[PDB]
Structure formats: C-alpha cells, structure tokens
Design an enzyme around this catalytic site. Sequence first.
Site, PDB file in Angstrom:
ATOM      1  CB  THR A 123      49.987 -12.789  44.281  1.00 15.58           C
ATOM      2  OG1 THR A 123      50.860 -13.198  45.341  1.00 15.58           O
ATOM      3  CG2 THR A 123      48.549 -12.796  44.782  1.00 15.58           C
ATOM      4  CB  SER A 126      50.177  -7.949  37.416  1.00 15.46           C
ATOM      5  OG  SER A 126      50.674  -8.849  38.394  1.00 15.46           O
ATOM      6  CD  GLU A 129      54.313  -7.439  50.415  1.00 17.57           C
ATOM      7  OE1 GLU A 129      53.917  -7.578  49.240  1.00 17.57           O
ATOM      8  OE2 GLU A 129      55.066  -6.511  50.777  1.00 17.57           O
ATOM      9  CB  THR A 131      62.397  -5.553  39.076  1.00 15.35           C
ATOM     10  OG1 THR A 131      61.313  -5.772  39.988  1.00 15.35           O
ATOM     11  CG2 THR A 131      62.631  -4.058  38.916  1.00 15.35           C
ATOM     12  N   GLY A 141      53.235 -10.875  38.144  1.00 18.88           N
ATOM     13  CA  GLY A 141      53.441 -11.189  39.542  1.00 18.88           C
ATOM     14  C   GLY A 141      53.071 -12.625  39.861  1.00 18.88           C
ATOM     15  N   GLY A 168      46.883  -9.309  44.172  1.00 19.47           N
ATOM     16  CA  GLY A 168      48.272  -8.909  44.058  1.00 19.47           C
ATOM     17  C   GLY A 168      48.458  -7.404  44.120  1.00 19.47           C
ATOM     18  CD  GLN A 169      53.418  -3.633  44.137  1.00 13.57           C
ATOM     19  OE1 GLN A 169      53.972  -2.961  43.267  1.00 13.57           O
ATOM     20  NE2 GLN A 169      54.075  -4.165  45.158  1.00 13.57           N
ATOM     21  CD  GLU A 225      24.003  -4.816  26.615  1.00 10.78           C
ATOM     22  OE1 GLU A 225      23.446  -4.776  27.737  1.00 10.78           O
ATOM     23  OE2 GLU A 225      23.669  -4.078  25.661  1.00 10.78           O
TER      24      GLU A 225
HETATM   25  N1  LIG Z   1      50.079  -0.681  35.994  1.00  9.73           N
HETATM   26  C1  LIG Z   1      50.554  -1.166  37.139  1.00  9.73           C
HETATM   27  N2  LIG Z   1      51.365  -2.280  37.117  1.00  9.73           N
HETATM   28  C2  LIG Z   1      51.853  -2.788  38.269  1.00  9.73           C
HETATM   29  C3  LIG Z   1      51.551  -2.200  39.488  1.00  9.73           C
HETATM   30  N3  LIG Z   1      52.173  -2.913  40.452  1.00  9.73           N
HETATM   31  C4  LIG Z   1      52.854  -3.930  39.874  1.00  9.73           C
HETATM   32  N4  LIG Z   1      52.670  -3.856  38.518  1.00  9.73           N
HETATM   33  C5  LIG Z   1      53.205  -4.765  37.496  1.00  9.73           C
HETATM   34  O1  LIG Z   1      52.920  -6.084  37.910  1.00  9.73           O
HETATM   35  C6  LIG Z   1      54.028  -6.932  37.654  1.00  9.73           C
HETATM   36  C7  LIG Z   1      54.547  -7.488  38.972  1.00  9.73           C
HETATM   37  O2  LIG Z   1      53.516  -8.222  39.586  1.00  9.73           O
HETATM   38  P1  LIG Z   1      52.858  -7.808  40.997  1.00  9.73           P
HETATM   39  O3  LIG Z   1      51.378  -7.521  40.865  1.00  9.73           O
HETATM   40  O4  LIG Z   1      53.603  -6.649  41.613  1.00  9.73           O
HETATM   41  O5  LIG Z   1      53.128  -9.158  41.841  1.00  9.73           O
HETATM   42  P2  LIG Z   1      52.061  -9.768  42.873  1.00  9.73           P
HETATM   43  O6  LIG Z   1      50.687  -9.897  42.255  1.00  9.73           O
HETATM   44  O7  LIG Z   1      52.040  -8.900  44.107  1.00  9.73           O
HETATM   45  O8  LIG Z   1      52.602 -11.246  43.224  1.00  9.73           O
HETATM   46  P3  LIG Z   1      53.932 -11.514  44.108  1.00  9.73           P
HETATM   47  O9  LIG Z   1      54.973 -12.153  43.218  1.00  9.73           O
HETATM   48  O10 LIG Z   1      53.559 -12.464  45.219  1.00  9.73           O
HETATM   49  O11 LIG Z   1      54.434 -10.212  44.678  1.00  9.73           O
HETATM   50  C8  LIG Z   1      55.092  -6.091  36.983  1.00  9.73           C
HETATM   51  O12 LIG Z   1      54.944  -6.238  35.590  1.00  9.73           O
HETATM   52  C9  LIG Z   1      54.722  -4.684  37.386  1.00  9.73           C
HETATM   53  O13 LIG Z   1      55.153  -3.758  36.419  1.00  9.73           O
HETATM   54  C10 LIG Z   1      50.734  -1.076  39.523  1.00  9.73           C
HETATM   55  O14 LIG Z   1      50.455  -0.543  40.599  1.00  9.73           O
HETATM   56  N5  LIG Z   1      50.235  -0.565  38.339  1.00  9.73           N
HETATM   57 MG   LIG Z   2      53.420  -8.775  45.702  1.00 13.02          MG
END
Ligand SMILES: Nc1nc2c(ncn2[C@@H]2O[C@H](COP(=O)(O)OP(=O)(O)OP(=O)(O)O)[C@@H](O)[C@H]2O)c(=O)[nH]1
Ligand SMILES: [Mg+2]
EC number: 3.6.5.-
Lengths: 54, 425, 349, 438
Positions: free
Chosen positions: D145, D140, D71, D179, D143, D10-11, D254
């Site tokens: 994913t 995360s 994505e 969001t 998200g 995921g992102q 460990e």
């Molecule tokens: N610390 C940190 N948190 C992130 C980052 N990107 C997204 N988040 C957190 O991750 C959550 C959103 O999930 P994402 O990881 O963006 O979603 P995804 O894994 O891409 O899954 P999708 O729904 O398919 O987009 C929110 O709580 C965001 O604040 C990042 O780069 N750093």
């Molecule tokens: Mg995403």
Amino acid sequence: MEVIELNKCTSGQSFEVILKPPSDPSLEEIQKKLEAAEERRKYQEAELLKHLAE
Amino acid sequence: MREIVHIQAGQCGNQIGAKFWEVISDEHGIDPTGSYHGDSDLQLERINVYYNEATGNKYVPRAILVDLEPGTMDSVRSGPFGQIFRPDNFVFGQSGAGNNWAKGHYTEGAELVDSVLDVVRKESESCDCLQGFQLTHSLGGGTGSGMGTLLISKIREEYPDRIMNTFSVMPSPKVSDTVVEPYNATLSVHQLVENTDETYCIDNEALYDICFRTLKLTTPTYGDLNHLVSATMSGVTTCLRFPGQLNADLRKLAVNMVPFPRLHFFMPGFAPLTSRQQYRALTVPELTQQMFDSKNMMAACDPRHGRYLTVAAIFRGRMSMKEVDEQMLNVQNKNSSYFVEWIPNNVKTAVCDIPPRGLKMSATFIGNSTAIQELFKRISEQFTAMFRRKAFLHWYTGEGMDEMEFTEAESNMNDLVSEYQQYQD
Amino acid sequence: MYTFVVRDENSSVYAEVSRLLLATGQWKRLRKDNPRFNLMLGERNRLPFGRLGHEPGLVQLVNYYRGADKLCRKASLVKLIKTSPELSESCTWFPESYVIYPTNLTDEREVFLAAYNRRREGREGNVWIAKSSGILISSEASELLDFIDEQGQVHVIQKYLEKPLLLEPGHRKFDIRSWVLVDHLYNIYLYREGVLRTSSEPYNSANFQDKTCHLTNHCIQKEYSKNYGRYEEGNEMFFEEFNQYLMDALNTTLENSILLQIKHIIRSCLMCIEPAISTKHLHYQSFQLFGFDFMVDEELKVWLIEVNGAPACAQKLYAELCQGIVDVAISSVFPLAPTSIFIKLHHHH
Amino acid sequence: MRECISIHVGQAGVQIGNACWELYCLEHGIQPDGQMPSDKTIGGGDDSFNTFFSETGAGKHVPRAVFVDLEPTVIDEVRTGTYRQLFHPEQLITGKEDAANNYARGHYTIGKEIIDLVLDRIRKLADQCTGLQGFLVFHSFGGGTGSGFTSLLMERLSVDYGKKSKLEFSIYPAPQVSTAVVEPYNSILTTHTTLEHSDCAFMVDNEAIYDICRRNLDIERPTYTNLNRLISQIVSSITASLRFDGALNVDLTEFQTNLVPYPRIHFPLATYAPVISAEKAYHEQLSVAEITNACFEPANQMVKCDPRHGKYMACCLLYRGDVVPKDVNAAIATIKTKRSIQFVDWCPTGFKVGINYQPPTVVPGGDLAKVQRAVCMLSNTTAIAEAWARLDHKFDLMYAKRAFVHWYVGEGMEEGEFSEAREDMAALEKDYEEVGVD
Ligand SMILES: Nc1nc2c(ncn2[C@@H]2O[C@H](COP(=O)(O)OP(=O)(O)OP(=O)(O)O)[C@@H](O)[C@H]2O)c(=O)[nH]1
Ligand SMILES: [Mg+2]
Ligand SMILES: Nc1ncnc2c1ncn2[C@@H]1O[C@H](COP(=O)(O)OP(=O)(O)CP(=O)(O)O)[C@@H](O)[C@H]1O
Ligand SMILES: Nc1nc2c(ncn2[C@@H]2O[C@H](COP(=O)(O)OP(=O)(O)O)[C@@H](O)[C@H]2O)c(=O)[nH]1
Ligand SMILES: [Ca+2]
Ligand SMILES: [Ca+2]
Ligand SMILES: [Ca+2]
Ligand SMILES: [Mg+2]
Ligand SMILES: [Mg+2]
C-alpha cells in the site's frame, strides 16, 4: 561570512549566512492504465477457468 | 477478520487434522465443548481466523471433515475434541477408495465432491474476508490424495483469487500401507504443482527416523508420527493465529516464500525434539542450531545438498529477541553458501510470546530449499520401477484412466525436479 | 569463522594476504559478489563504498580508504599540497609543480611560464619534467607544453632534481620506496624495510634524451638498460646495504640523513587528509597500504615524488609485510583464536 | 494563512502519522479531546497552527489529515486510541484486505477500486481551506500500500490539484525491521512513478533510526513505537516552520526553493541532534557548537552515507530552544575549518538558519530526554545517492532471475514496468554523479 535577511519575531528568528559566492498523465490516461491492467487480470483468470473447464 | 477455511480428507488427513485442532484449541483456551477458558487476551485476538463464534460464546472450528468411508471420522467424533466440530461439516461416503487415486479423483470421489463444496460454500458465505483454504491429507492413499486434489481443483475454480495451502504427507516405503503409494503421490504432486500456492511437504520417513533415532521410540506408530505433525502444524500457523507483523496472512507468506510459482513446496522444521533430560532449559543458540539441523526437518532431504531460496523462522516463548537476531544472523553468516545470493535478505524471523504447551520456548522452521528435489526424486524412482513393467496399473485403468495420464504426471514431476536443479546452481 | 571476498585478482600483495588468511583455518573466502563478508579486498577502480556497512551483524572492513586518491593522483597531489594550509604552497619537501591541462580541453600554464622565465633570466638550472597518471624531460618550456598538447589527459610539470645523490661506484641515480600501512584507527605504520630502485647507468646531466639513467623505474631499467643487475640484484638495494654505504662514504646513517625526513613527510601527508577519509565514526572501517616514492639530492635532502595507492612489494619482502598487514590491519579488527616490523608514527588525531 | 493537508498511507504512514499528531497536540497545547484553551478565537482563526488544525464551533481543533490503509487493523488503533476524538470517521479510510507487500496489488488491483473514495475524502478537507498550500504524504517504500497506492494517489493529486506542492516523508526499507523480500522491487517501482509528482521528499532509512535508538537510547531491540517517536521529532522539526510564526520555510513552496535547485534531485538528507536517553541519570546539556557539529556525523543522519564524498546543493539549519544567531555562526565558522563541506560550483556556499525559541517537546513517558536546544539540518547532498545504489543493486540481483516477478504480472502489471522503473533509477544515479563528482 555575511549575515543577511535577519527576521525576528516573538517565537524566534531566521537569517541567512553566505560563506562564499558561486562560480504529467491526464485523468484519461490514468484510467486507461488502470483498465489495461484490469483487462490483463481478466484475461489471465479466463485462461485459468478455460484450463479448469478442460 | 481474515478467515481461513480448513479441510481434512482421508484417513491420514482426518487423523492429523484432529490432532491439529486439539493442539491449537489448547493454545487458544478452547475446551472440547468449544468454551473459552483461557487467561490471556492474545488467545482471542485472532481466534476468528480458525474458529467461528456460535451462540453462548461458543467457538466452533471452521473445519470440514471429508472421507469416502465412515470409519476414521467416526473415531474423530468419538475422540477427545470430537464434539467441538460442527456436525454438519462431516461429509462422508461408504464405498471407500481402496488406496486408489482414480477412485478418489474420478469415480467414488466425484460422486461426493458436490456435497463437500456445498459445505465449503456455506463456511465461506459467513466469512467477513476469506483469506483462503488449508487442506490436510496424505498423497499415498486414495481419498486424501485423489479426492483431496479434486477438491482443490474445484475450490480453485469457484475461488480463483484465494490462497490454497496444503499440509501434504508424502509416502515412504519404510512406513507404507500399499505398494501403489508412489503412483498416487506422483498423480497428486502433478495437481499440487499447478493448483496450490503453498504446500508443506511432510515425509513419513523423516517422521519415522525422528521418532526412532532422536525420540528413541522403539516401535513408532502412526500416533507418534502425528505428534510431530501436530507440533509442526501449530508452529507454521503461529504467524496466522496470533498478533504479529511477519507472514501474518496467507498471501503475504506466499509473496515472501515463493519466488517462482511452481516452486512452492516447503520443508518444515521444529525444535526442540527431546526424548524422555526433558525438563532442561533450551538456550537460543541451541534452538537455532537444532531448528536448522537436518535431523530436525520433516521432508527427509539434506539441506546441505541444495540451497535455500527463502526461509521463515518463528520463535515462541519469552526470550531475548536481541539474542534471536544475533543467532539467526550467525547461522546465515556462518553458512551463507547454502543461501542463494540473488535473493537478498531471504531469511525472515518472527517472534511470538505464547509458547507451545509444556515448553518454555520453541522454534519452527519453514524452508523453500532446492534440496526438496530429493523427495520428488525418490518418488519418481519408485514410480518408474513399477511403471516400466506397468505393474498394478489395472487398479487404475479399471476406473477409466489411461496410461498416458501416468506418463504426463511423471514428466511434470521430472520437470519440477529439473526446475529445482537449475536454481540450485 | 571470518569471511572475506577478493575483488582484485591482479594484486600480488593481497593475493598473498588472502593466501595467508586461508592458511589460518579461521578465514573463509566467499564468492566476490557475496555481500555477507567481514573483509573486502576491493577492486582498484570504482570500489562500491556505498554498499559497505549495511549488513546487520557483520563488522565490515575494506582495504582502501575512500578519498585517498587525492593523495595518489599526479594532478590531485599537486592541488592538495598547494591548497592545504597544513602543507602550504611553500612546502619545502615537494618539488615546484604545476597542473597543466592540454589545450584541447584550473590550469596553471601561465603561472608555470612566469616561474620558468624567472629561472631562465637568473642563469639558474631550468630543467623540468612532464608526466601524468610517457615522460618527457627537457629544459625548454616549448617542448614541455607541446608534448602535453599532443596527449589528451591532464599532466603535471614539476622541477627536475638536477643534483641527485649518486651512488658509487656507478655515479647512478635512484629512488626510495617506503611502504606505509594505515589501520582503521588511523595509526600510521612505516614498514621497517624499504628498497632503493637504482639506475644501473651512470647519471648524465648533458643528455635527457636517453631516459634510462634518469628514470629509476624497475621496468625501464630491466628493458632499456644494459647494466641491469650489475651492482645489485635486480637494481634493488635494501636498507642494510644502503645504510652501510652512507656510513662508509658519507659518515652518516640512513636514519639521521634520510629517514627522519621520510617519516616527517609521511606524517604530514596522511595527517592532512585524515578528516576527509577517516572511518572513525563510519558504519564501516578502512585500512590501506601506501607506496611512497622519494628522491634524495646530493645535500641529503629528501623530496617526495608521488604516493601509490596500490603498490607492489619487493619479492624478498612479500612474506614479512603481508603477514604484518594481517597482524595490524585484519586481526586487529577480527582477532584469531615481536618486535613489530612497523614503526608507529605517533601524531595527534 | 494557508492550510496543509497531511495524508498517511499504509501501516508505516498511519503509525508515523499517529505519532506526529500526538506530538503536534503537545506542542500546540491541544488536548486529546481537541480543545485548545490557549486559542482565544473560538471556532475560527488564521493563526500559524491553523495551517494544520481546523476549528469547530464547539472549539475542537481537528487535524487536516487523512488516514488510508487497505486493511483496518492499524487504523482501528486510531479509532479507539488516546486521540480517537481528534478525528471524525470521514478522515479514517480502511479496506478489508491489504496489498500483500505487492506494489502492483496496491497500485492496480486494489488501488483502482478505492482511489475515487480517497480523493472524495481529501476533497472534503480541501473545501475547508481558503488557500490550500499542498499535501504532506507519509508512506513506506516497502509496503504494497505504501508503495503501490501512494504513487497512484500522487498521480491523481497532480491532476486534481495541479498548482499544489506535494512533499513526502518516505520510509526506506531496512532488513533489520522488515519481513518482505520484495521491498527493493516496491521501492524502485514507487520512486519511478512518483518522481515527477513530488516536489521534495525526506527519506528516512529504518536502519539509521534503528541504530540511533540502540546507540543513543540504549534500546536493545527497538520497536515501531520507539522508531516512530523519534521520527516524529524529526518530522516536527521540519514542519515547525509551517505551524509557528516565522520567516523561513513558511510555505511548502519554500521547501523546493531552498532545498531543491534541480527537480529530480529532491531528496534532502536530514540530520538530528541531540538524541538523549530519558533513563540517563542526568545529561550535561550540549551547546550550540556541539549540537551543530553533530549534524556532520553520519551517526545522526536519517540515512547512513558519507557527505564528505559528495557535494552540497543547499543547507538549512533548524534550531529549537535556547539559540541565538551569534552562537550559530561561531559554530559554523569552526566547522568549516575542520569539516569537508564542498558545494557545487553553481550554488552559493551558505546556510539558511531558522531558530524557534520553544525547545523540543517530549512525549511523557517517551524515550527521549528533555534538552535545552536541538537542531535538525536539512542538506541536499549527492551522498544520499548511496541509498539509491544499495537499493538498485538488490533490485538487480532479484530481477536478473525474475524472482517474484510473477506476483506483479499476476496483478495486471506488465513486466516492462520493471525495466522502465530501473532505467529511470539508472538515470537518477547518473544525475547525482554528474553533479557531485568531477
Ligand atoms: N519506521 C517505521 N517503519 C514501518 C512501520 N511500519 C511498517 N514499517 C516499514 O514499512 C515496510 C512495510 O510496509 P508497510 O507500511 O507495513 O506496508 P503497507 O503500507 O501497510 O502495505 P501492505 O503491503 O498492503 O500491508 C517495512 O520496511 C517496515 O519496516 C512503522 O510503524 N515505522
Ligand atoms: Mg499493511
Ligand atoms: N621531479 C623529478 N626530479 C627527478 N627525478 C624524477 C622527478 N620525477 C620523476 N623522476 C624520476 O622518475 C621515476 C619515476 O617517476 P614517477 O614515479 O613519477 O612515475 P611512476 O609513478 O609511473 C613510477 P612509480 O608509480 O612506481 O613511482 C623516478 O624513479 C624518478 O627517478
Ligand atoms: N503421518 C501419518 N501418515 C499416515 C497416517 N495414516 C496413513 N498415513 C499414510 O498415508 C498413506 C495412506 O493414505 P490414507 O490416508 O490411509 O488413504 P486415504 O484414506 O484414502 O486418504 C500412506 O502413505 C500412509 O503411510 C497417519 O495417521 N499419520
Ligand atoms: Ca457409486
Ligand atoms: Ca482559533
Ligand atoms: Ca505537479
Ligand atoms: Mg489407510
Ligand atoms: Mg605511479
């Protein structure tokens, strides 16, 4: 307050201090869950299409 | 590459859709001939969401113009950005719909719908990854209302897993063309409840009141009203057209805005709305206050009469994002009685550095409020006043419809009202 | 416009505080489950401290110190005094106490019997009192231990002050309630007004069976005593009258003979646990009102009886104290658009 | 030597992964093109850094990493970014449309169609390992994913790599940088289905990182780049023992042995200090005692909570820079006489200490300032259960009304999975309470 297992190397060292002593699902089952979910999606979409056909 | 297919139907649908493509074309640096002349890379970062790229680096809107009479679409083709639309995407008949939902949905519209879907299919076959569709239309007429909801039903049949989004102009007796508008709007609301994922409710009375009381326009015209709709359409779609992380696509927006599938009717809001003291700078506190003020909303529903299920806010321009958070949290904490407590953190804020044309900064408001039931209550009351005497029904029975179909659409809209009322308490 | 929620409907103190807050026109009360609050008037038990201070843009304050129960529990207080070097087992202002678990369940049974047998052998006064968070006074260790086993909760056996200071006329026992407020900065404020909850029955050292002249609880005096309200209204003497008594009878003042020890005891208790409950560097802030109960012996020595973490107030003093709580505990964090009624007990943080 | 494979989902996982590997390269002296001049064994070697980097014949040092996102936009940054040359295309996997913040969409609808491809790419990396230890999974909670696909991947990894350890770096949702309203749903759904498959998980609450960046780094409105640079420092301090010569936490096994005496309670609290702003005129360098004492301040914990009101089950101190054992024990002794540190009775009251002489590396132009010594404390406290309490409460508020449940049932998930997952969290909260409270 005892130090034990002191290990030293060129890049650092590590040790332990003691202050006081004490007192799955198979591949088959995963595929079923994924197909069971896919079947419910197919059923829901077929009901929508049946609705649109009426 | 998350393409959106745009459709505009009927007189209102095409006149507002035309202005929409005029406003966002300016924001993205596209001129009337589809040539890009902007100066920022943010303009093209997500340009393919709404525009196709033709030979010679031309950008052609992914829009399909539909109507059952030629008149309005002839005006668009002669309008400012008329040449920018794909000529084959004009699909129109000659009979008209006579402000008759039955003609647009069952008789005249049915004869033309297959050719519209041929153009929709063509536009979809060229999309790398189609998000879904957005339709602009009124609910008080015949083509946009009756044929518009017919298109939605058939688009859903052929693309059942894509998102269906509409900008729907609700009729008002203060800005009315015919007395049958409540009939046509009730029949359409029935369709929308079942077949759309997101519907922006644009009430012509709210637009009128804003033009008259706030903008100080003595005699508001349809043109004046469409300026407000243009600005609002550009605001609510900023999250789709520019780089961002919040409500960045249609499905994620629905996931955050629709807690129950039938309750997907939104109240849009825009700030500022200034009369011609138009050069004064607007502070973040002012943007937030106005954006949440009922006088800045376009559904003609008092938010203090209901509760917000979800809220999406977009701030545009170069401004203190730290001060945006503070003011947004101030609004929630100073009036938390108007936000349902069983959806934690239901107010989401997005920022965009590119402001609308001629404004240092603005804010666009999107609310899923139970107060929207007041809009469906007005329609239902106007519906029943005529339907209890069966007045004007012959226009519809003459097109093959039965009274039972009116009773069913009425009951469903009354259920929708009741459904909103239960989550308001 | 500040916001607060009420989660303890049975609190007379904060019911008045909530009433005052609304009267200011600058505070709004929210539903008890609304998380967007500045101030939580929390419940007594299982207060959800873990959910406080996670609201972006809200400075959140609560009227209880997480962990103060260590001080406000019969068995917890004994363990805290014996194990804390600041208080030490040799603490001179707390009666010799022991934690005793019923046999149907560490436990200080044998340690208590050792001290008990020593007193019995040394002809000394060997009267103890058993109680828990149902009280028994006896001079025989057999009755004390057998009484606790018939129950199923932890108890405490501490020495019974056989030489209490007796008011005159009446020859009657009493205890002193002191209200103490600790704000978010951990300043210790002692309310200038205390109350003596007096027994309206003559003290009788040769009969611990009738517990009306030995227990100065307001409910017991008003339920099982026949001279209630005879000497003072509601068996409540206030500092003004009590101070005049000390001057006429003992040629001394309440400040010199008693209040110095009380302030020293309050300081010692709260300073001891400050590192464990301070909210100085925490994501939320705490304050709390405490009710300290003291005993005075015939030598004008002050003994600590217990500490109450959710005390009630004397009817005549609700108005002044509740307003004081708003001034130093609530408005100090949330200001509004004297001659303080408190005495700040300075100390090193 | 034994290899470790890092998986970023995921992102959040991908962007955090990009920041860690940027830091890994600077720490090991690897250039963006993959070259490592200090490595005198060209095309091979079993040095400690080889646990994370493989070597080509031409001398390129390639991360043992897989990036997965439903994505392409986020992973497209890796393909054309500074370190585009570190990874070969097989390591970067992207789909066309994401999970729309919908656990069921990432786990069932989309996950089912891409899971076998991801395993195949992981298998390629595993085939380069002569003794694979296990996996580090970054994702995360909130998200679609990061939550939905990760739990599906963990289930399969346990099937295809039964004897391998799996650690997590999980981002706990914070409204200030979120969001998606349904993130409490996704967090609890992914914790329920992943719990039995993760041997040790380091939770990072975005709220904690956000406030550290504002308070310590003087960033008025931190970005993901600010948050990720700081998270990679903490991640680097945790994995340094696997990448450098040493005797503490030398293999993934460990971590469980030292931090997790009870399998379900495998969420250690991380605390890091010092965090100093690079824009500061110049800082008075902090001592061993001062950085150690800072480990017991809620303000530098990766998850805000109060360890004073829980019980410790283990504690590791991981120092980097100018630190000798004598000064550590002197600081610990002084902290015991001032701090409330209560261990569980069935565990010893002690600390495992690791010291690496190389101070923390700082990304040029980053936000953090160079410090002479830093410490990351890994403590298994029952106080981290406060984070489960907060999360389960928000879950309960929405689920009582079934808000948004239709989005999950519409992707093929059964509604009963909601209650099944919530009951598992109720049992998790009860386990913490049995261990920590009397
Ligand atoms: N610390 C940190 N948190 C992130 C980052 N990107 C997204 N988040 C957190 O991750 C959550 C959103 O999930 P994402 O990881 O963006 O979603 P995804 O894994 O891409 O899954 P999708 O729904 O398919 O987009 C929110 O709580 C965001 O604040 C990042 O780069 N750093
Ligand atoms: Mg995403
Ligand atoms: N060790 C002791 N020596 C002498 N008297 C004692 C005593 N312990 C308790 N008492 C008497 O018992 C009365 C109340 O006891 P205690 O305070 O322990 O019960 P309690 O906590 O239910 C009442 P409160 O909480 O209001 O103070 C006091 O007024 C005191 O006179
Ligand atoms: N805001 C706005 N509303 C319009 C416009 N034109 C028509 N309407 C409204 O739409 C309804 C009439 O529908 P119309 O679009 O003209 O009929 P159609 O061509 O058959 O779809 C009435 O309620 C009008 O108030 C317009 O340009 N702007
Ligand atoms: Ca015809
Ligand atoms: Ca090598
Ligand atoms: Ca396993
Ligand atoms: Mg018309
Ligand atoms: Mg009591």
